[PDB]
Amino acid sequence: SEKYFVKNGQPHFLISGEVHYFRINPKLWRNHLQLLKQTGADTVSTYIPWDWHEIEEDDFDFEGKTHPARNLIRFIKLCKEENLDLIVKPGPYILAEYENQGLPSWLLKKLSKNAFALDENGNVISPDLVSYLSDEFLEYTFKWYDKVMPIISKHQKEHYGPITMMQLCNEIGVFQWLSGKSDYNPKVINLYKEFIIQRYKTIEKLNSVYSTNYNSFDDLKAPSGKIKLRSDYCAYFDFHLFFREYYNKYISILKNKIRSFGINIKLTHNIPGWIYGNASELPMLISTYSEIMKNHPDIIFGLDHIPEFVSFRNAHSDLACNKILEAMQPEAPVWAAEFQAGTREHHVKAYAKDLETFYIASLAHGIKGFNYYMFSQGINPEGKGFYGKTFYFQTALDAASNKLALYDSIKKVNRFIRKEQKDLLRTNVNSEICVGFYKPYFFTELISSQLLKEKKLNVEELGLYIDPRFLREEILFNGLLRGLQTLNYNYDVVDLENCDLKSLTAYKQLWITSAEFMDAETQNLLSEFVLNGGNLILYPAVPTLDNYLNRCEILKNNFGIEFITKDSSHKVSAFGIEDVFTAFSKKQIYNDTNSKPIAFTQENEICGIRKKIGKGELTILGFAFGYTSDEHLELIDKLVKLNKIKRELFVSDKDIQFVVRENNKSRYIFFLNYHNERKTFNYRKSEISIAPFSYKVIKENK
Amino acid sequence: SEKYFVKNGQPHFLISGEVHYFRINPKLWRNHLQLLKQTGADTVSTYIPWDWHEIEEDDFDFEGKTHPARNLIRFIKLCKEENLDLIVKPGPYILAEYENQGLPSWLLKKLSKNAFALDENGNVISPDLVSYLSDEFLEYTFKWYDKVMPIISKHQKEHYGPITMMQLCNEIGVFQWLSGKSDYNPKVINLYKEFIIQRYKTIEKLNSVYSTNYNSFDDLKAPSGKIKLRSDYCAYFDFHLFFREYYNKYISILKNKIRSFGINIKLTHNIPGWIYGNASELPMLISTYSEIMKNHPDIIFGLDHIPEFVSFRNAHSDLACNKILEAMQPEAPVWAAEFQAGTREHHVKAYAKDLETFYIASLAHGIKGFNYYMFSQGINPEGKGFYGKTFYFQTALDAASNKLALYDSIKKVNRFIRKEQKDLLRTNVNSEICVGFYKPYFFTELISSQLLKEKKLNVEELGLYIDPRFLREEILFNGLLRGLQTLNYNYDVVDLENCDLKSLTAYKQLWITSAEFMDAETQNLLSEFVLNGGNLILYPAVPTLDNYLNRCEILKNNFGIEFITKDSSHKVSAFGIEDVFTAFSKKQIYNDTNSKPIAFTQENEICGIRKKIGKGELTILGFAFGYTSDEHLELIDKLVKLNKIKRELFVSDKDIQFVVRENNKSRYIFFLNYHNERKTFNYRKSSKSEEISIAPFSYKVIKENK
Numbered sequence A: 001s002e003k004y005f006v007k008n009g010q011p012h013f014l015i016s017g018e019v020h021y022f023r024i025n026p027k028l029w030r031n032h033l034q035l036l037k038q039t040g041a042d043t044v045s046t047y048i049p050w051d052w053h054e055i056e057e058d059d060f061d062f063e064g065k066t067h068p069a070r071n072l073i074r075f076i077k078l079c080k081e082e083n084l085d086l087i088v089k090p091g092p093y094i095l096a097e098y099e100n101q102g103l104p105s106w107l108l109k110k111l112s113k114n115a116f117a118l119d120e121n122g123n124v125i126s127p128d129l130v131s132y133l134s135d136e137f138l139e140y141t142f143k144w145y146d147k148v149m150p151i152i153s154k155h156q157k158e159h160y161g162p163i164t165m166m167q168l169c170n171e172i173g174v175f176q177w178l179s180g181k182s183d184y185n186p187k188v189i190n191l192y193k194e195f196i197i198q199r200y201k202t203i204e205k206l207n208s209v210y211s212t213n214y215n216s217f218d219d220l221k222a223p224s225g226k227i228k229l230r231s232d233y234c235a236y237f238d239f240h241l242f243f244r245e246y247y248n249k250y251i252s253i254l255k256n257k258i259r260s261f262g263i264n265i266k267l268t269h270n271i272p273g274w275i276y277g278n279a280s281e282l283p284m285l286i287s288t289y290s291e292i293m294k295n296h297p298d299i300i301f302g303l304d305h306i307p308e309f310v311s312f313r314n315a316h317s318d319l320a321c322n323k324i325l326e327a328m329q330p331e332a333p334v335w336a337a338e339f340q341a342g343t344r345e346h347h348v349k350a351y352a353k354d355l356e357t358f359y360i361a362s363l364a365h366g367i368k369g370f371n372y373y374m375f376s377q378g379i380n381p382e383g384k385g386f387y388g389k390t391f392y393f394q395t396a397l398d399a400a401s402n403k404l405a406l407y408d409s410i411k412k413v414n415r416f417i418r419k420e421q422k423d424l425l426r427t428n429v430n431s432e433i434c435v436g437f438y439k440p441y442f443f444t445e446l447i448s449s450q451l452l453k454e455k456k457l458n459v460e461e462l463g464l465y466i467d468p469r470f471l472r473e474e475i476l477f478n479g480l481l482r483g484l485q486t487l488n489y490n491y492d493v494v495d496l497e498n499c500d501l502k503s504l505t506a507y508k509q510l511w512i513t514s515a516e517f518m519d520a521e522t523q524n525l526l527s528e529f530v531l532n533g534g535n536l537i538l539y540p541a542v543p544t545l546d547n548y549l550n551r552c553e554i555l556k557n558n559f560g561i562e563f564i565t566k567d568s569s570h571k572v573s574a575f576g577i578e579d580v581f582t583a584f585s586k587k588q589i590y591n592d593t594n595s596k597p598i599a600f601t602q603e604n605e606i607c608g609i610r611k612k613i614g615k616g617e618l619t620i621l622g623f624a625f626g627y628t629s630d631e632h633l634e635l636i637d638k639l640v641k642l643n644k645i646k647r648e649l650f651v652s653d654k655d656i657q658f659v660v661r662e663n664n665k666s667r668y669i670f671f672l673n674y675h676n677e678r679k680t681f682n683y684r685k686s687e688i689s690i691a692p693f694s695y696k697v698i699k700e701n702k
Numbered sequence B: 001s002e003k004y005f006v007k008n009g010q011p012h013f014l015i016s017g018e019v020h021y022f023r024i025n026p027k028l029w030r031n032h033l034q035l036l037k038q039t040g041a042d043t044v045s046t047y048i049p050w051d052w053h054e055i056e057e058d059d060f061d062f063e064g065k066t067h068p069a070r071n072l073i074r075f076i077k078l079c080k081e082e083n084l085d086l087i088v089k090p091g092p093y094i095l096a097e098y099e100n101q102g103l104p105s106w107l108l109k110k111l112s113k114n115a116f117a118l119d120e121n122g123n124v125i126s127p128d129l130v131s132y133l134s135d136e137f138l139e140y141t142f143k144w145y146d147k148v149m150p151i152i153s154k155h156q157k158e159h160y161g162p163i164t165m166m167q168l169c170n171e172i173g174v175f176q177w178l179s180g181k182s183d184y185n186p187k188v189i190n191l192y193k194e195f196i197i198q199r200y201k202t203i204e205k206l207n208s209v210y211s212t213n214y215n216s217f218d219d220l221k222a223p224s225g226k227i228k229l230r231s232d233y234c235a236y237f238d239f240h241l242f243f244r245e246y247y248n249k250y251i252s253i254l255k256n257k258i259r260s261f262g263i264n265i266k267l268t269h270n271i272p273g274w275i276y277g278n279a280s281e282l283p284m285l286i287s288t289y290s291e292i293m294k295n296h297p298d299i300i301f302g303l304d305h306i307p308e309f310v311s312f313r314n315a316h317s318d319l320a321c322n323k324i325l326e327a328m329q330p331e332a333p334v335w336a337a338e339f340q341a342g343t344r345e346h347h348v349k350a351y352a353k354d355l356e357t358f359y360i361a362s363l364a365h366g367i368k369g370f371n372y373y374m375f376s377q378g379i380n381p382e383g384k385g386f387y388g389k390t391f392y393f394q395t396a397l398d399a400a401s402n403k404l405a406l407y408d409s410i411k412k413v414n415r416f417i418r419k420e421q422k423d424l425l426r427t428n429v430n431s432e433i434c435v436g437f438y439k440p441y442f443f444t445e446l447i448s449s450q451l452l453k454e455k456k457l458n459v460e461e462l463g464l465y466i467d468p469r470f471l472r473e474e475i476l477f478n479g480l481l482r483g484l485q486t487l488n489y490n491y492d493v494v495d496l497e498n499c500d501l502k503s504l505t506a507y508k509q510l511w512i513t514s515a516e517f518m519d520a521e522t523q524n525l526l527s528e529f530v531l532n533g534g535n536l537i538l539y540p541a542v543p544t545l546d547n548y549l550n551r552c553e554i555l556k557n558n559f560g561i562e563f564i565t566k567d568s569s570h571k572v573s574a575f576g577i578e579d580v581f582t583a584f585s586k587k588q589i590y591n592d593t594n595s596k597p598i599a600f601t602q603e604n605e606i607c608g609i610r611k612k613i614g615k616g617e618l619t620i621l622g623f624a625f626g627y628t629s630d631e632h633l634e635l636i637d638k639l640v641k642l643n644k645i646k647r648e649l650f651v652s653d654k655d656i657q658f659v660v661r662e663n664n665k666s667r668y669i670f671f672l673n674y675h676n677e678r679k680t681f682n683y684r685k686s687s688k689s690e691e692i693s694i695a696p697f698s699y700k701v702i703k704e705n706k
């Protein structure tokens, strides 16, 4: 049932370290690889920078003819000699704080204007930002592939070379995330028009959905600027769908080119999203890959985990990310393509004793493999670093292969993983709680994000009060998921799109965090789920609109729900918990015919009900809470207990986090202390001391 | 010449604890006070909530007639019986996570619309946010003062009562900041129009400064929306100056009302600005008090310190805040009106082992007094909690008066303070580095802030490239001040406004982080500083404009500088350090005349020079760096060493922070480990080494006699 990497027909914990040959003295390449191997790591990972090897147009150096660190062939041979598999990442973009994000200077100087990403006025966004589907860009990329891919092909495991996986490009769409700016290159906009014509067929159909007044598709302009009208919201929503298709078109062109060289190894991509040590934005980035993940079961997405520290401040981020990736990519192992080792930023410290606990928490939280990024520090050759001379700090090895504090922590964790991997990889958590992932709430990287300074989405201007980003970040990510993890309740996430009703019936509860909009398919799915016997928890709104904000009241009608939206005090009472602070003055006040009122405004109006519908159960809360008080944990705890869901253990100290992972034969209990306090506690099924910011793992035979 | 509190002609370290009588069972008030006193605390501090005591309009209960915890009179009497002095804080605002920020429900229901703070459209910003100078608001505030101030007056120290200090209102302007919006109430707009007429006298004089074409003062409207023209920037700048006068008018009215009751105790106010465990925006909030601190030498401002954790992520916030308060308020002790104890937010943990280190680091960083907030947890009675029933978590005492983990941390810190206060309060650090505080760069809370929704200031649209908020946050607060603390170089901060030259002359170096604009007074001051023998470090720009962005080339001319602004790679070389990453493509390129070139662009163009001018030294860097790489600390270290400034200690681990505080009698060495690593190191005085092991996120204090 578990998904995991495999070696010699047995479960294999992928342990890789990132070592950038192009940033290390070649005299020390062997020493880096030997020290990596000696930690118990089985794989080494690097970019192959296009700028580094195509030194001028049509002049390629893979053998160290012009600089000894351009000897890619020697580095591959060393990986084989030192019994390490190799992950290669030839771009064309690598980012990696490399000048021009890895693109050659000669390419960027030569490209015509129409090869660049352009703003709505036709101006170049950045001198290093190409348009992904530019003919000229793809032509040069293809010429780079024609030289590097025969080398990669020749050194695959299949040919007793070390190469086992390859990454296509790097964080596709990342530049639109960081800036909040879309590419308005006329070629992109022409592909958007085709997408829209393809989707709606006729201008009449588009006009009926958008409430627009176009006489033809010729009137249609790409959305830009702030959303003022529901028709702007519609146009922006489809612009987001378009970019998901556009990224799939791009990765598909790279993939087919790569396969033409007989490269049959596993292909990968990588998901960014961590900011200042939390990852509440990373699900937005996962959502940009929805079309790739639907159309390429054979490309494995891995996570970029950048916790920076390890405490209760960010304890929930890595589990929520790992669970959401599992939801969106069920047939591949959850792995960290970039797994924090040292720090990209000198002023942002990465302590060995923090990251050691992160590595163990990552096991508790279901990771099946990872690539220490960066295992080895680098020195940028001759000014090629976007920033300073040095690449990463407080790594396992410095650029000269000196061992640093993190080295012994990685060796310790790796020793544990190798000892346990056969059993640990085959373990799962028993989740009786399912939490819905409704991707359209996440489709906002161009209009609402933590990195977008000037917000283009202001839902009050559209006659709405529940912002999808506030809902997904504060109510879902930092609220419900943080609360369940804090309370030591297992949850799974499920992608509600094309979701199998049968998979939902495993669970005792399905939690849906709902805004005022939800498409007909999902409203019908949730109707069927309850009617057939499911227990649904739905807040803060019964939705009444579809994704285009047109009337859609299927769930409301199927459930016999009537409500008025009314202003009251932020505080409500729910299930006899007084003074529950809620996010909004506006709440849904429910008719309680055939219902049991279970939440009340300061004036005692009914803002929550329970109801039997068919064979199932509905709990509807007309108010938004996350986790910003002890009453919020008390409410989550009461809701879970409505369907008699129990934690696996009684642990005497409620601030100890635990995860029970088991299979038929084996149980692992992971105890995690996310607090600056030496804690002593006892546990039983439903007396140990753990240092601050530390862990303990117990094995039980069943 | 340290500033410290004095009790009975001796240095006294003010140790207060916050205990909310209105949130504690009155049967347990005495136990809270006794347990606070047994920590060595000398004072207790509390709000007196208007909403709690004026239970309906003109219905006052201070005696526990309608609820036992309304018995203020009994709480005051218990403070005196348990030998604690009392700080009282009657508002009208208290915030305190109390419903409606402490304002009565009946008042907010009753007030007409023109009592409230309004957006430019004329809509109520928030149903609990009044306009400070609303006539209606002040009429009711005065009726509340008429009832609470006689009680406060009767129980003052001079009448053998326990009351030694009183706070006026609470964090003035904290809602113009957190709401994310400016107050356009017509009382405010009409005071602004008066302020402008008084400032400029004639529409022609205003038009000459703004470059506007108004026919009369009646054509001038309060600025709103984004800054697109330099005239919009000028209007907003004066609007910032006006708000500083407005807050001074508000506090002045409260103070004059208070003094009429025969209240002669020390008056206080409290500075907000921490959020998410950093205080990089606090200097903006303290700048909003510039006119209060000039007009009211008798009102002592204290800091509201909310670190939440204690690590290298926020190590520099408290010291930079303490230094900036000292710059703005040099004639009073640096103290924390609210000094984090426990957590206001259940989900934001406060560990005893973090806060204990914070307390010792605060001592190293020059704090002279503090009020643990919250010493005692409270339970909100009668639904009065803004956000839930429980007020604070992980405090020294729970609401029931049980000791929690933090109680022994506070006892330990207080015991050290009581043993050492006589010498410790008199100790100074030897600062050879002075950093200039140029208040106008901070005057942006209406146009550019971490909290403001709409970014209204885009300097590129004004033909500028150095944003004042970017400069003061990243180049100064997170950059230079962070860098100096990390490198263990002592610095002082000086307010450049009406700054005496003779105060600056004791320093080996003056550091000025400059934008393209600087007033003529400051350009002249820095000119005289160097000509008379001062050593000036100036970056990232020689300014060429004044506060209204009109030509002012005084400092450029006085220093015989010629430059052109040119685009190049972010990377420069400086003092032989290669690949120094700088914030801007644009750099100042200097003529090499009568100077040594010490920084170069990727095209080897000169972007920094050193020269001798009169008796003084000038170092100009035409590029912007904070602390975002190791090259940045190397560069700060090189600049400090130009004048042979030395650290007080050789320490074998560069990641250990230390402060040496000394007087004639005594030397204290504070070691601070802001890192999750057990560190073993050795040290010695710059003029046999001692070995020390320090736990993660911990401290050591060594006392030397002589």
Ligand SMILES: CCO[C@H]1O[C@H](CO)[C@@H](O)[C@H](O)[C@H]1O
Pocket: B095, B171, B174, B175, B178, B271, B272, B273, B274, B275, B276, B304, B306
């Ligand atoms: C208005 C509430 O003010 C609170 O929260 C602010 C943000 O963290 C702090 O800066 C203030 O000191 C605190 O009083």
Ligand SMILES: [Ca+2]
Pocket: A560, A561, A562, A591, A593
């Ligand atoms: Ca009904």
